[PDB]
Design a protein around this ligand. Structure first.
Ligand SMILES: [Zn+2]
Length: 503
């Protein structure tokens, strides 16, 4: 094997809203922004006391997964945290969450960038050097020219292995900026050293490292050979000032975290790191730059939109610029693009093929897109009923343990305090719709999986293939269906299921 998708069975984990990483379960007097649609807000005004607002998370733990498949899932809407690959339910969560991607060519120009670049260039180079005539707009040229003629500043690229000065800088930054005191080396290794990717991507070849370090000197027309995650360190007079942790994807570069020395707040290393990453993308032959998830309301995450980008649309797998949909996404409410040509009688047919899974979509600029979120996911939304008869049909015929629920389980009440909800709700945006799944079953498309799908039993401590779909126990069928719903038929085509009833 070289690229088998080996993970655990996805499960729905719920935690109280106070543990929210951005709102902490509160946003002030704007109770509407806690919800996703105003209709549910008006519905639950009477039930504000018994509303069990949580921080919805869906995901699973990964053991081994290829970098290209990671790119596919990152374009789908997932980014991993440590070794935990997950994404939130857009509808039932507490805070909104989208993925943004940026191109190096479409950067805007502001006075702050000019000032910071000028200060950095003045600092690193010698005072006797005369600056060239290259315009400040060409930031890549400015950065390269500044780095060519400096002796006190240099950066290096190394794998993600553990060290001691890195941990010292990490704890210094923690206790100085976030007042986190219980940091431990094991916690640091878990946070920034666990790697689902294989060792080949982790350690790489020395020639690849040489090319990555010589990135300022690569002529266009060559291919960047290295793949996987890397760490970038910013030396200055022989001592560390910052650490950049990121990864190299075939379609771009993503960012996860950043640590800098507290005493060097003068240089404002965050913006400099972002600009240097953009310069790396431009000088290299990569094309995009995934900044992470995007949250609108939260003031801590708003800075990511300064560079300008396009926020992902979960229900269509398309990328659209933020400018046309600014009013649509204002105040943090879920949206789905739509046109007057097509009605909303049934759910959106998510094309479960390569043409519609984590790849770009050239939109029709003639039509004026309009919000249809309240049409398909509103009080009179047709999703709930269709889900109901679909679940009834699957349970009646194929025996999959699907069950029906009343048209109010969008936000469960205090009754779920007795039993923690572990199942994936039927009504969830950006997922495979139930009726399409029923079409897959009834058309015999499920007959493709058998012969090359692998199911691992912890009880037997062995790996077994899928021979007959219908002969499996009902729980196995439920888990397989959930995986196919969450990640896709093509993804499950070349995956390995670590299924166990021991848990
Ligand atoms: Zn929240």
């Amino acid at each position: 094997m070289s690229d088998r998708f080996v993970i655990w069975a996805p499960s729905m984990h719920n935690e109280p809203a106070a543990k929210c990483g951005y709102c902490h379960g509160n946003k002030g007097g704007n109770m509407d922004q806690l919800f996703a649609l105003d209709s549910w807000a008006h519905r639950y005004m009477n039930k504000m006391d018994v509303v069990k607002i949580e921080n919805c998370t869906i995901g699973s733990f990964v053991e081994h997964m290829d970098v290209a498949t990671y790119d596919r899932m990152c374009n789908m809407g997932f980014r991993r945290s440590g070794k935990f690959l997950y994404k939130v339910d857009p509808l039932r969560n507490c805070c909104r969450l989208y993925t943004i991607r940026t191109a190096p060519q479409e950067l805007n120009m502001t006075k702050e960038l000019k000032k910071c670049i000028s200060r950095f260039a003045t600092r690193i180079t010698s005072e006797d050097y005369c600056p060239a005539a290259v315009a400040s707009s060409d930031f890549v040229g400015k950065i390269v020219n500044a780095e060519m003629n400096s002796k006190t500043f240099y950066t290096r690229f190394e794998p993600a292995l553990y060290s001691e000065e890195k941990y010292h800088l990490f704890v210094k930054y923690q206790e100085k900026v976030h007042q986190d005191y219980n940091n431990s080396p094991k916690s640091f290794k878990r946070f920034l050293c666990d790697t689902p990717f294989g060792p080949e991507a982790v350690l790489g070849t020395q020639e690849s490292w040489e090319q990555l370090n010589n990135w300022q000197r690569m002529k266009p027309g060559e291919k960047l050979k290295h793949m996987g995650p890397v760490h970038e360190c910013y030396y200055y007079e022989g001592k560390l000032i910052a650490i950049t942790v990121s990864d190299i994807l075939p379609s771009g570069i993503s960012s996860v975290y950043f640590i800098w020395d507290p005493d060097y707040s003068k240089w404002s290393l965050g913006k400099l790191s972002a600009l240097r990453d953009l310069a790396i993308i431009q000088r290299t032959n990569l094309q995009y730059y995934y900044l992470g998830y995007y949250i609108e309301d939260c003031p801590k995450m708003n800075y990511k939109a300064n560079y300008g980008a396009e926020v992902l649309d979960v229900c269509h797998s398309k990328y659209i610029p933020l400018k046309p949909i600014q009013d649509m996404i204002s105040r943090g409410k879920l949206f789905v693009i739509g046109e007057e040509e097509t009605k909303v009688t049934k759910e959106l047919y998510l094309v479960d093929s390569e043409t519609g899974r984590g790849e770009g979509f050239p939109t029709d600029n003639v039509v004026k897109y309009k919000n249809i979120a309240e049409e398909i996911y509103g009080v009179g939304g047709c999703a709930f009923k269709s889900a109901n008869e679909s679940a009834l049909e699957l349970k009646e015929l194929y025996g999959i343990p699907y069950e029906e629920e009343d048209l109010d389980t969008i936000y469960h009440l205090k009754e779920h305090n007795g039993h923690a909800p572990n199942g994936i709700p039927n009504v969830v945006p950006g997922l495979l719709p139930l009726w399409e799944l029923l079409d897959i079953m009834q058309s015999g498309k499920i007959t493709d999986l058998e012969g090359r799908l692998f199911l691992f039993e912890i009880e037997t401590e062995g790996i077994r293939p899928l021979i007959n779909f219908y002969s499996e126990p009902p729980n196995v069928k439920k888990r397989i269906c959930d995986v196919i719903r969450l990640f896709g038929f093509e993804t499950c085509m070349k995956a390995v299921i670590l299924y166990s009833e021991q848990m």
